[PDB]
Paper text:
In humans, the uniporter functions as a holocomplex (referred to as uniplex henceforth) and consists of the pore-forming subunit MCU, an essential membrane-spanning subunit EMRE, and the gate-keeping subunits MICU1 and MICU2. MICU1 and MICU2 are two paralogous EF-hand containing proteins that are localized to the mitochondrial intermembrane space (IMS) and function as gate-keepers by sensing the cytosolic Ca2+ concentration and, thereby, regulate MCU-EMRE channel activity.
Similar MICU1-MICU2 blocking is also observed in the second class (class 2) with the exception being that MCU-EMRE subcomplex retains its dimeric form. In the blocked uniplex structure, MICU1 engages with the MCU-EMRE subcomplex at three major points of contact using its N- and C-terminal helices. This would position the N-terminal poly-basic region of MICU1 within the proximity of the C-terminal poly-aspartate tail of EMRE, allowing for the formation of a putative salt-bridge network. Secondly, the α2 helix is positioned directly above the D-ring of MCU’s selectivity filter, which is formed by the four Asp261s from the DIME motif at the external entrance of the channel tetramer. Several basic residues from MICU1 are in close proximity and can potentially engage in electrostatic interactions with the MCU D-ring Asp261s, including K126 and R129 in α2 as well as the basic resides (R259, R261 and R263) in the loop between α7 and α8, which is disordered in the Ca2+-bound MICU1. Most notably, Lys126 is well positioned to point its side chain directly toward the center of the D-ring and block the channel filter.
Residue numbers in the entry:
A (entry chain F), F (entry chain H): 48 to 96
B (entry chain E): 191 to 343
C (entry chain R): 87 to 206, 229 to 399
D (entry chain Q): 104 to 470
E (entry chain A), I (entry chain C): 191 to 341
G (entry chain G): 191 to 340
H (entry chain D): 48 to 98
J (entry chain B): 48 to 97
């Protein structure tokens, strides 16, 4: 995998630029929304039954 | 008249290559813009999958430590993890391939590419035919200019 | 501790002593410009204890009939601090345990070993008083609790009169400014805020409600449990519940202006409610008096 | 002994520490009576109630979890005199069955028993229409709502067992049987409620005494001390230390009657004040000795004490056989035995530490 | 005009192969040095992954069977596996990989090898350029055996 | 994986017609009949016992 | 010596292609039918697999929410998962092939194609032989036209 | 997959002879051994030593 | 003349093929017997693995229904299922390749094949050297007998 | 697949340097470190709780 047929060097794989900041800055809000909407769901469904 | 005929053959193939590249350039622009369109959409889909993956975990995180017990949520997590494999099986029943992440990524990108093709109504078949003709002209010229099969001194 | 050395009055065998008046200065005032000087103890002083004791009123007028005619050691001073800061820190317990085998009538010899351990020769006024002139008597428990009562009451009297600024009463802001001698927060500016804005200032208020207030501050953890019930119940604290909470803290009830002024200081982003834990913290910065 | 038995005891001590209380009630209950039109309900014995409280103790193998002795009582079968599990005059008898205890009743007893008296004083005197603890049923539900929010913080409502609003109806069974009578009109005083608590605690304690088979009403000194050390880790080395120290003395065959242990456990209701008294007896030069122990106890709690009890108590809590008691070790083990392993069941203490770190974040936000 | 072309070109071509080899000769020892200096680090991080898996087993072992219940540890048990299945999806979003372990160590080794070359300022481009030219000449001579012998 | 060696962009993938409804038409009633024989199994087993 | 040979070879190769495409139609007319019934049976297998999934889901759904406890069915629902892992290993040791979905449907496809090839007396032996000869001829005509491009 | 690059059908897939009953007759004895071995281990464990 | 000369080259090439088939004959029968031996050993390994999973199923099947509880054995159960994944990650790192069933079965059969070869001492290397030679001569005879190109 | 295209047989698989008595020796100390810091975490939960 490292080398080619020719024994060359494969190029550096790209990184999604600033993707680490992206992935946690998308983890955090949908964490908080999965918190929020299900607090909503609980507060409604206790009133239904 | 050997070499003049040979350079005439080479000139013929290389100027067919020139003309077909000249036709390649206008449609390639519409191709590359619809590519960045569908790429924007499929990158949104790639992130939205992780958004779903997080907003499930927010629900399941709040709902075991704050306002229901693990006695309550444990069967729900079982049925979610079972419906996981059930949906991944149903995907294979839907389309004739597995649920593999780069494979489905390419599927969704290409499917959005054809959705953009049907909107913009560009000549995808001409694009296919011309783009094959270019590469065949390149490979046969690669066969032609061998310094072990010298035709051009 | 070091304030005993800061406020010492007499010198016998190297021993620093405090008068009742320097004790009054130490409890009213943290430190002063006044020097609190130290003179050597002549043997008139062990008869000054008698001659003050032969004259002074044995209740809530005791030190003010004494003035300087008294003796307070370092352990006795820490005991006086324990009286005025730590009620129910073991007083029925002590007369049960120190001199048992009968009633709660304690003996003089367990007196001194009292002084050191609750806080953790010649006589002062105390064992000249409690056990008789040389230890002929035994101290009575109800009489000692009466002594606690009128002594702490005499502290309240001193705070009232010194902090009346010559008035017959305390105003609202006299009492609340009194109430913030031991408050040093960053919301203190907020706490003074309702002082200069949200206060119908003046409104002279007597000593007996001040006594009721002080006894309210004594029984305080029960008020903490009631406002903890009001923490784990979303019913906000209005005037009747706060009255009822003071009553179940005491068995006694009080003014309005004290109570409404407590509301006005302690609304604090909750309208017509009590900032209740915050109020407890204000009273315990008041009660600790620095530690 | 017995490795399977040791692991079951591990498991059930994990349960009584940290489980969820509905699953606890489903664990230790053994009886399932069929209201033959409707369905069966799941009740437990007072014995099962004890073993639900008591650590290091087990119930037999077919009881387990959700595997009940099925007692079909009421329906077509002519039921004249149902099985009096509890003695008459038990608190457990006086609730809505002839010696049976529901789920809601289990929550109720866990609240009332494992809560100090002072908190109920304030609880009555806050919501009573008067400020004088005279309380109706509605404010009593308020009391239960506030104080079920103290011990069993993690509660739930599956709505299949009695977790729901039927909790309130079993509470109503307790009142209509016993607190407000038939009409549900009058109020209940503070004093009668605390009397009720004290008698409940006494009945629990008499059953806890009873489970040992006291031959001639007298318990083995080792078995007595093991009851004294119920809420603990392993103090078996101190158990045998008390034994071998007592194996010097000639008292170990003498047993202990119920009345003495009754007296000592009433003395424990005052013992959290004489931490002070024993603490000042430390620095006053006097020695922790059994004579002054029972003398101090007969002064402060005024309850009589034989020498034999304090022999065993001392030889337990003496400083490893040196002939001297230890102050705060004994105080903490008495507060542990007193609280019956109450505070923070089903722990999520990282939540409180997250709040503590955020208070420190707010405290550096002052900076 | 067809065969002596092949003979003189063959002499020249094995000569040029020799020149490519001699121009390679000082370089690729540095490549094998960087090949060690990356690969040892990658083995370090893989044994570190196994060690992390061991610690994650062990803290769960102690935190159940001496501290807590299982029933107050079965949730965090579940959330760890769910977090791992979340994390591998995040890996796939970051780089377009399935996260299979040979592809894992291959991308990690590429990340270490390019930093190792760049810190050592290794002319990677002249390396693999010259390697490709070497490979082309070698496949040329493997051709030049066959119709020059088997016709 | 998107294009060829020629760079020709690959053809549109197949989708079965109404297929989401074709699978949702099978997921649901088999669930329902398994739910039925849940009752049939439980009632008969409490009948024998 | 090529213009004669490729003048022969083009014409003869189109002759071979024509003759084989004559031969192919009776076999291919059977191949379509047998492939169709194989595809029908395999698609039935796929939908039956989804039936298995949903039905197991529903029977394990009703019990732990109305009739039985989860707490007494958590072990069974562990054991069906472990039995499923054992079934994957059994598929592995039986087929000498990994249990994955397209490979599984191709395995069952060729089984239920060759049952049909048995039941219809189909000359598979001739069919693949013809397709091999036609593939050879197609390679030949491609390698004819490409030096024609040179 | 099912069609060769030559347009042809694959060779016939092979099974294991009696391999189905090999599984059906290998699972069952070793499941019974798993039944047996804990019975004859645990009672031994509370027989021999409890550390 | 080119006729009998080129046909003689063809004839010597099929002679060379005959030699390559000839020399393979005494060697091949130790390879076949080793292959069959390691085959039965691999067969024991595979059915052994199935026997293991049935055993590990059967232990918990005994205990956790009706020798015992289920809420006691769920930690043992989860720790076993987690240790399975731990050992699979280990088998990646202890091999530098992935654990997927046939591509590890073939590793084990290959290992048993070289195990038998080490005892056997029969020049497997000269064997498959000869195999590459005869397959090369096969492709030579393929290319030399082009139907399109007359010779 | 053990046989290449040409009929030849693939090389010997490489085991790595007595792994079974060194991977076994590295899971255990990290597991001890883990159980130690988990115990440390519970005790620190009590300490900062105090």
């Amino acid at each position: 995998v490292i080398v080619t047929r020719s024994g060359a060097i494969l190029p550096k794989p790209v990184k999604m630029s600033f993707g680490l900041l992206r992935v946690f800055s998308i983890v955090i809000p949908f964490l908080y929304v999965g918190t929020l909407i299900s607090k909503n769901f609980a507060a409604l469904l206790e009133e239904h039954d | 008249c050997i070499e003049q005929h040979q350079l005439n053959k080479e000139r013929e193939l290389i100027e067919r290559l020139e003309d077909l590249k000249e036709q390649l350039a206008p449609l390639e622009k519409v191709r590359i813009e619809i590519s960045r369109k569908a790429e924007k959409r499929t990158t949104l889909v790639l992130w939205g999958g992780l958004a779903y993956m997080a907003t499930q975990f927010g629900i399941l995180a709040r709902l075991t430590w704050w306002e229901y017990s693990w006695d309550i949520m444990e069967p729900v997590t079982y049925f979610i993890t079972y419906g996981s494999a059930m949906a991944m099986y149903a995907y294979f029943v839907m389309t004739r391939q597995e649920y593999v992440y780069p494979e489905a990524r390419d599927r969704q990108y290409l499917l959005f590419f054809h959705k953009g093709a049907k909107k913009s109504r560009f000549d995808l078949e001409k694009y296919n035919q011309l783009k094959d003709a270019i590469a065949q002209a390149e490979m046969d010229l690669k066969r032609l200019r061998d310094p072990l099969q010298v035709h051009l001194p | 501790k070091q304030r005993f050395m800061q406020f010492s009055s007499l010198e016998h065998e190297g021993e620093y002593y405090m008068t009742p008046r320097d004790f009054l200065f130490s409890v009213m005032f943290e430190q002063m410009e006044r020097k609190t000087s130290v003179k050597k103890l002549t043997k008139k002083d062990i008869e000054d204890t008698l001659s003050g004791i032969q004259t002074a009123g044995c209740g809530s007028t005791f030190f003010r009939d004494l003035g300087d005619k008294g003796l307070i050691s370092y352990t006795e001073y820490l005991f006086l601090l324990t009286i005025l800061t730590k009620p129910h820190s073991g007083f029925h317990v002590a007369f049960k345990m120190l001199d048992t085998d009968g009633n709660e009538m304690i003996e003089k010899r367990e007196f001194f070993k009292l002084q050191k351990i609750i806080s953790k020769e010649i006589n002062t006024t105390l064992q000249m008083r409690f056990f008789g002139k040389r230890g002929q008597r035994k101290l009575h428990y109800k009489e000692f609790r009466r002594f606690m009562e009128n002594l702490q009451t005499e502290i309240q009297e001193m705070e009232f009169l010194q902090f009346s600024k010559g008035l017959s009463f305390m105003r609202k802001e006299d009492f609340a400014e009194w109430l913030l001698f031991f408050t040093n927060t960053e919301n203190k500016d907020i706490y003074w805020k309702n002082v200069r804005e949200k206060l119908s200032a003046g409104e002279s208020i007597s000593l007996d409600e001040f006594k009721s207030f002080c006894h309210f501050t004594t029984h305080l953890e029960d008020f903490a449990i009631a406002m903890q019930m009001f923490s784990l119940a979303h019913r906000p604290v209005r005037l009747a519940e706060f009255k009822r909470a003071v009553k179940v803290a005491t068995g006694q009830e009080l003014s309005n202006n004290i109570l409404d002024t407590v509301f006005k200081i302690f609304d604090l982003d909750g309208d017509e409610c009590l900032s209740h834990e915050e109020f407890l913290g204000v009273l315990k910065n008041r009660m600790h008096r620095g530690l | 002994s017995g490795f399977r038995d040791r692991k079951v005891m591990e498991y059930e001590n994990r349960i009584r520490a940290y489980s969820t209380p509905d699953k606890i009630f489903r664990y230790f209950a053994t009886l399932k009576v069929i209201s033959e039109p409707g369905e069966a309900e799941v009740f437990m014995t007072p014995e099962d109630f004890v073993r639900s409280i008591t650590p290091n103790e087990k119930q037999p193998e077919h009881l387990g979890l959700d595997q009940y002795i099925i007692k079909r009582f009421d329906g077509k079968k002519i039921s004249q005199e149902r099985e009096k599990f509890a003695d008459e005059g038990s608190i457990f008898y006086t609730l809505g069955e002839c010696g049976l205890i529901s789920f809601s009743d289990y929550i109720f007893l866990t609240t009332v028993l494992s809560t100090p008296q002072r908190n109920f004083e304030i609880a009555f005197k806050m919501f009573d229409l008067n400020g004088d603890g005279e309380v109706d049923m509605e404010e009593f539900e308020q009391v239960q709502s506030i104080i079920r929010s103290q011990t069993s913080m993690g509660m739930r409502h599956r709505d299949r067992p009695t977790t729901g609003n039927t909790l309130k109806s079993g509470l109503c069974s307790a009142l209509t049987t016993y607190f407000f009578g038939a009409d549900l009109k009058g109020k209940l005083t503070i004093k009668n409620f605390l009397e009720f608590q004290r008698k409940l605690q006494h009945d629990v304690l008499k059953l806890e005494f009873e489970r040992h088979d006291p031959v001639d009403g007298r318990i083995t000194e080792r078995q007595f001390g093991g009851m004294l050390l119920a809420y603990s880790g392993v103090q078996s080395k101190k158990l045998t230390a008390m034994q071998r120290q007592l194996k010097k003395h000639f008292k170990e065959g003498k047993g202990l009657t119920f009345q003495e242990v009754e007296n000592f456990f009433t003395f424990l209701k005052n013992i959290n004040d004489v931490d002070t008294a024993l603490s000042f007896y430390h620095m006053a030069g006097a020695s922790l000795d059994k004579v002054t122990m029972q003398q101090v106890a007969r002064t402060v709690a005024k309850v009589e004490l034989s020498d034999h009890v304090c022999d065993v108590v001392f030889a337990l809590f003496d400083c490893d056989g040196n002939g001297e008691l230890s102050n705060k070790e004994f105080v903490s083990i008495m507060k542990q035995r007193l609280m019956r392993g109450l505070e923070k069941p089903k722990d999520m203490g990282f939540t409180r530490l997250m709040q503590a770190m955020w208070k420190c974040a707010q405290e550096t936000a002052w900076d």
